[model samples]
Target: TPEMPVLENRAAQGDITAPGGARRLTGDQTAALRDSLSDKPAKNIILLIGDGMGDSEITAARNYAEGAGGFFKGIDALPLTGQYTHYALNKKTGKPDYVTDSAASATAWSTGVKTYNGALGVDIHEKDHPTILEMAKAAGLATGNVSTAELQDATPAALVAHVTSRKCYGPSATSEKCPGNALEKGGKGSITEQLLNARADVTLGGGAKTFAETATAGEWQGKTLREQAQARGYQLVSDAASLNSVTEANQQKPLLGLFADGNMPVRWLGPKATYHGNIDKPAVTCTPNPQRNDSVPTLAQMTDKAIELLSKNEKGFFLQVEGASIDKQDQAANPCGQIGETVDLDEAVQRALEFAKKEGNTLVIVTADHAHASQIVAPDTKAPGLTQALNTKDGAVMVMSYGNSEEDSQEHTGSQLRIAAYGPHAANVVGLTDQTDLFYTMKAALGLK
Candidate 1:
């Protein structure tokens, strides 16, 4: 418990803790997931979150990676088959909204509760709901959450904190929309503060900007969240070079890596994004600063480091790695970036399978929160971005849908996502699941009850 000094180091919401050892899984919750669990259960759980990785996107990745043959590579072979409906139950109306942002979607699986959109680990009533990662730490298991987006982004944030808006991530939340939480006003809590309080053993990803020093009371006071994390027994690394060094040296447990001020770069650029979708500033070829690009670690690199450090804990571990750019590119309707990132996420899934097989008692599952409309209309290039003629080939005259037109899609779709699992009780996962069911499913897999 000393590793998680959160209980002794903070206040107000600090009293809010994850379900743990004594409170592990109760009689009812245990019985609820018993059939889903194999007799042996599982010791470690690795959840691979491919943000916006819908079924169609997987097909596109396969098409791009394998050409027309499109043979089996990543997710096709998982024995367990299931679908999760990613919809949040709005608290005020007490009805399912049927669509969600990353925050609500992650919260559903993280806390086993449906909440309003952008409500991180909080119910509709704004009460804090503890997460699986928190519970894992509480049970003396090593815990960590990684992402290609900011470390404080909605998906990772849901696993470690409670807040009303996803944009509330600080050291600087000056937006009129996200003034942030306050105890005097009976508000929720600071996103970054709550994150440290939750005490995930290994945390990685981008968003250094959100943690760069704040005068917000009860928050990390160091010049930056990086320094604050180092103060809290974390080996903070910022660049790809330092990540490699830490991984090779088996540096520190409770590690924190923040590589960019925003979301990490796209794996590679694709065709549809060629003209930037006929665009202005493209986010793919960028980081907080270009000088830092060489130092940025790939998602797999961080995943490897997270597993290596957390596996040292005898009590077991819960690790969450995210492929965040998939959703971002999909939203932009940028197939090149979307498909490229999908393949990268696929490779991570492959590594997870290998790890699960090697660890025997580990449960590795891949699933997405929601979807976007980035389907392949027709096949053309062998690589993701290839030469393809548009439908209208007017002789000498050019006709095209104006890139800035309203017709271009840029929103998340309410979709059912597939759950691909391997190892331990993987085969038991068949048919349908509410996104919230994963909380109990994971607990049952870990034999928490």
Candidate 2:
């Protein structure tokens, strides 16, 4: 229930929640957000994904936001809502497959295919499929991909690359399993190469070494992906200073920003943003920059910049922004951490809503690829116990137990999640559908041919 007196009191206190300021969604707000889906085609489409967000995860965040000082999340205020079911059945045997992973599930939404777990934007037999992002690119609309994880992580990679496994994100493989399987049998470039060749208008996130010269910035295109990208007309920005170069009005070319060698830090841990231009030959190189915590940009800040640059397209744009860490925290059984990530995710959601409202021609969709291990439940009073669950990796079940089983379950379950939309054509999303429908729905709203 969005009805609680202290909701505003806490929301008023305000922590770093979202953009457009913080205010609790009133009783009628959620109702209004739920009922309206538009008939008009959307000029712009903003897809915001909370990687592992589910009903209980949302409830926990809501409960925490109400009790703490976080703003009421704007996603709850979306005008049209529906249920999303991820299809993860095995294609070879036609049996219910293992719990969905980011790559497999994201592939379904990105390419509209039901594939094996760990697959990128490829079908069951590792055949290449065109992604929605690719479609948007062919149509000449601007494209943006943002995430808290490395930009090449499964969810983001699905939008660009077609690989058999998700592990080829880096240049070197740690094990035989890595360099996963390739989409191109005698295919030319790595995932990073494919990304550069893809030429998305706006790409921001971690994994800097794989792109730019980190001193220790490993190889991509025989040199650096960012260097190659810059040569190809993409702006190569490394630190806080270079990121300032990204904007709708000032910059004409597409923008690429990489801040870390691996995953960006969580919202609580200030960004240890990196830049070679600010300093001399000495560098942090795949390590956290210790110079200044506040120097790095937040997820909210990144989303704001992405929207600005992408919206510049006269033909409009398609932007996919992800809160990638929520699922990581949930997998680790860090309930509170996942909740905090949700708060950050919700803040990004608010930023999207703000843009949608201001333009009134865009369509904003908020959803998760799949639900995860932890879910809030009735508190068990009598000496809460940990329970065992099978976690199958490579045809093997890893023994696991939920630390806080009574409260947050520690395994990704087959849970139904809500998909909410706002702005023009938003009401077209008002019904139940499997995850694959998103590709078709969003494709139509964006007026793709």
Candidate 3:
């Protein structure tokens, strides 16, 4: 019962063992919660996604970083919370499939349509739909997309590209994997190319390697995508210093910052869970990943920079920030890696909330695209798959288990995800809903047609 408040008066005077000590002093929050509800139109919308973060993952992170009785300052700070189903369609039969991949789940929220696993910005029938970012841009509003993963990764790519496959990252991939989307085939090129066409006011993340691929048949045929970006008036920046030096980002010269060749390295590192490792091996602590140096801006930094640039438009702005490695690390069965990413996302969430609370009209939402494989089990229980023991902030051992697949990478789970929000229309996230409903909620909040 995190909502009930366990350490609200932490370091102060109070005995949680007392009957009323653990409760909120305000007693009933009915009036306060009701008064918090609003349908007022928003001038901006900040969407933060924690890729593959489920209840289990959130709980583990909270336990590891903040005691079992404690709460995260950001992930647990949203005023409205609800569960939403994330299911994908079967391409051949167009039937509901309980499990979903990042592309289909992202497409659901990005384009308001259910698509087959591995599809981006398209329905099962291969019909591409406009994403919220595209719609917002068409309505003359500034838009931004930021992620720790390769920008061509599904979560961010769905916002600006409409490829038949999520694997179509660059021209070469498009020609080989999605021939119909190849430039030589008179299509939109690839995710990287369409991203240029989409022209969001601000785009920042990894995947610098994809930009090295040359366009095959466009007007700039044989030119590298990086050159295409330069020709298209992009103010390119590669490091934290360069990114900060930019004073403006708009239609005239949009900002494009690529920090890594692939997904950005994670923030923390620790032991990979092995069968019965929890029971036999001693609990371990996670340490910072040295690969994450000063040159690599944290998720919060990218989000703050995005907001600073995109909010220059009087009409308003729409930004999507994704902490991508939570999913990547989960697949690798690394408990510390996933927890660190989740905490990193919470900090980014804190950044969004800071701006939204001050502006009063910005809608801030934090959610996961899909549930992942990590789960909490008894400390001594032996798992059939992978397991790890961690020394949590609670000064207790918490065992994590991953038993979803026989392959090297763990599988994504078919589970409802938690979605939380603050500001206008936040009430819309307070009940059980489909992931597609988020599109309508955001579209309506922004008054976009």
Candidate 4:
């Protein structure tokens, strides 16, 4: 793999770079690269993971929120944006263009190479690779991992786990395969175990179901990660109220927050409804179980809380906030839901930016692990009442729908990823680059070397 050159002279004056080249640069190019690098050490780091967001998805998010007139509407409304290429190596065979799964995509950014689709913190060769989180911990930095999905999901798992396959789901009592690979088996440990051992200061998001004895009963089996975290002196919070209640005084102990049984409810579903269980039965006519009785916190709220707790440390911190359902909806080919989720993610990004502005030492990098379906933008004139007028102009409104799968519940499409950044190290993402380059970019920004 060769180092690609950053493109110069875009008419828009925005950042742009060539894709896929790894070679020594000339003196001029080297100086240009140096100029592109941030000189200061970042005291804090915030990485936003849009699990499967793609260009068209972002465009639709912008269109639905801001409109085609361009007054700055959605997530793309952020100050910085760029392109990212996503591809992975085959996990078992080490082949190229292997369908990069969330695990592989995450490993690429965390460890700097594409691994098997389901593997975490390991390369195609099945070698344990140090992740950004592990590196940060080794450097004595405070760390936080927050997501709307299960804390153990690939995107979140990449930060702390090393596995040969992503499907290493703990314990399957019903299946023919015995519970040999269980995280609790022989205490050999799972990714969650590694996370507990890493002593990440704050861990948030849903997945209590996996760690709990039963779904209805939030009884955490002693063998679960939440239990381990609690045993390690972590203050556990399973609901929004408790999450909000965590104070600066408790910063010495790790804070473990698991808001839902699995993935948290999407943001468009509304925070009050999700946390307080205040469902507008009339508003939710589609699902029979209209009892919006889930305690998932909004991405914004989680980010705010994570910042609050992590900032208390004098050693600085690393926080990862993920918009998990964006990819889930995209895989389902549900355009309306996908756009709504992206809008929700943008809200979370805004919250992060707010904190970064105040905590000037913070470095915030926002990007997706991989692209989803190549969403197509429909014309503005084709809107409902304007259909007749649109016919006059030979225009039609059409959006690339996501989340329509027959066999699998969701699907991953091949598309280019989008990257956006702010803070000291963000300049590196100003232009186009391979997914692997992001690892070095973050390292360079934080002065990790």
Candidate 5:
């Protein structure tokens, strides 16, 4: 006999072969729709970015993990949704570049200005701009930044640091690539240094290696960045046990958790996409990666802790959490890797939603920095690029293709991305908007200057 299929959730699919059996609703939702609208200002804001997670990425992951007709309880549960255009600018010509990288796309929303690729917290002209997180912090709101990537990586760095290039993660890199932003040049300093200066109440993620570098110029010039963090009164934690023991995070003594030396290892791993691999290899299932041990807290755990620590203030907080590896795995054309990161991010989103629903005054927004390179192609289709076949959770075969680039890494695509929200100002994301509009929306929602 054939193996029995296991139903994962309570929402059962009625007999779809029968007429009118797969309908979604009974009557009009006009009353329920009207009840969801609110103009009240938000006291707290949690913005989650799935780096390079476009509509196609979402669909592919959905099909693999929940079947074609199923939905993500967190990602798909947001009542308000829309699309946004994310395009960077040419630094010299000032023309639209069409496509965007993590740095420029993040700057667009963090500072409400378009910039060239690789630039962070600056405009096309290399002029520094205050970020939304900075403004919120200045307004006496608690601030937190978390991600699966290094702390100095583009997405999280955009919120706290201003630099000419995203590659300037440390003092050495800043002196080499972004001298104008270096401390010896009388500028801000490296991304890590600026992050220490920003002094958010809660900061977490990888990049422990960068902290070992000595400061080239400053009050603590000869001290390592880690020493500076300690001297500056940051309660640092490296493992899950240490992180769980922390009960408070504030301006006097903020929390800084570094779980990995580099980017955190992904939750799952499987076969990499090779040319004609989909047709030649048998469909495989993803397995847990042993490297992602219990010592390193998951994205959801970090978010929960950040929320717990930051919520102590009478004034609400502004937190940014990123699922940074989705874009990295997509660039490498690893289907299972990307899918696992998406699932990880969805769990973080679920945590955000749970907090928002209970608080009633918080706003939660989820989106991607830019669209990426991944497509669900026909099973028998022959492609000139990388491809893979996976055994999906629905007991179906999913053929994934990455054809944007014929080289080692895939390229980002110039396309509109999904933006969804819940709570106050959620309606603003209902219609089409530009990436820059998100800054104003978040700023206004928090009533920040």
Candidate 6:
């Protein structure tokens, strides 16, 4: 590796009262802060948005995936480090009363603005705005968006769509009963629609049912969108097997893949259901499908395939692969399950990191849009005493437990988020930052204005 120049200018000398201001410090302070920034060059970029993961959740994932006292096998082995920051914007008041919802957080990173929650590609008052994906596309880079949630979900939606409300659904342009429906929120000219028009190179993940025009009661209705993509010269696939077939062809055209009607099944579901055996000796497990049949393509697999297809382009590509279910599990408040999902995301990160190592110029970023309440670290404890199921009223002392939820709803909470990066720009994200800084960091990583 070669030594790179330090990034400093008149802006660095600005006072806290001015734009880009910070606390006044001496020469030593300035040098210390400057040293924290990375100086490497980035060619390709990969960002993993774990929708709702926090410190406690990450710790749980480390414990479950690596067993007791084990380090995080996926992210822990990476060459980068971690930091903590809040992902919220306040109202007129200076107090941090308002936490970020997914839509606002997504827009924060996608558009570099802190808009209200439930708004995509739009400002606080529902004003239209350009997104990072749109900017990347205009720059002549191949772009891709992948998620475990419906492709139209907020995280993926922020990549391309611009709308006042995040919850839009249905084929008709006038439907507004359900706020989060894909079609309604995206509008006819929304991100997904724009994607169809612009012919974005690659799109994968769930929510196929919503895009179909004549989809059955339980089927995906996004067929019209698929057809539109095909008309624009995009190769289309609807399942894991089909995705493999399409990627194997190694075609130069863009590809769109949709798997499952909604979100993919949780990994903890694995391949089996339990049953009681004869005489209560033990429970029997049976898998209706073979291991090969049961295996859903991991996010890591999707990342690898997307890279293989997009790298053929001389202009390079930009891919966004999300661990969309981390937030879902947290909403369910299933600690063990949430950890498993985070591990699944780590697997995807591991794949991207490996690619960055081999490609040498690709930028890999691992971070979350916001944090959830499930981030509890339990102290070590012994198992239930022989013949006694230990019951203690002071549940707060439990080693591994989450905060109580009054109701069962899938929602995001206000908490500090975690970020990690690899490649040249990864160093720029070392300390805490507003989520909006991510957009600028990514643009910087890609050498975009």
lDDT of each: 0.67, 0.67, 0.90, 0.64, 0.90, 0.62
Tens-digit lDDT track of model 3 for 187-246: 987999999999999999999999998988978888899999999999999999888998
- For TM-score, candidate 1 versus 5, the one ahead is 5
lDDT of 6 by residue, 105-128 (tens): 888888887776677777755666
Predicted candidate 2 versus true structure: per-residue lDDT over 1-449, tens digit per residue: 32111112225333335663454443455544433535678888889999888876676566554442333556575656788788586757756575788888999888777888888887777688899999998998889888888877888888988876687764443123333442223353456666776888888888776664311122333555566667767776667666766654212476777777777766442112111111311211122225424656667777888888787678888899998888876766544456667878888888988887768778888999887765333332122333222211122222212343344445566777899877766665678887888888888888886
Candidate 3 accuracy as TM-score: 0.96
In model 3, pairs of residues that clash are none
Selected candidate, larger TM-score, 2 vs 6: 2
Steric clashes per prediction: 5, 7, 0, 15, 0, 19
lDDT of 5 by residue, 73-173 (tens): 77877777899999889999999999999999999999988999999998988999999989988999999999999999999999998999999999999
**What lDDT score goes with residue 102 in model 5?**
93
Candidate 2: the clashing residue pairs are 33-78, 33-79, 37-427, 38-427, 372-412, 373-411, 373-412
Runs of candidate 4 with Cα error greater than 4 angstroms are 1-38, 70-74, 171-188, 213-225, 249-252, 269-295, 377-398, 402-410
TM-score of 1: 0.78
Error of 1 at 123 (Å): 1.0
Q: Name the runs in model 6 displaced over 4 angstroms.
A: 1-38, 82-97, 177-191, 214-223, 247-252, 270-295, 375-399
Give all TM-scores, in the order shown.
Answer: 0.78, 0.77, 0.96, 0.76, 0.96, 0.76
Model 1 lDDT per residue over 301-344, tens place:
78887788777778788899899988887767565567667777
Question: How close to the true structure is residue 320 of candidate 3, measured as C-alpha lDDT?
Answer: 96
Q: Total backbone clashes of model 2?
A: 7
lDDT value, residue 369 of candidate 3: 92
Error of 3 at 121 (Å): 1.0
1 or 6, greater by lDDT: 1
Give, for candidate 4, the lowest lDDT window spanning 10 residues. Answer: 385-394
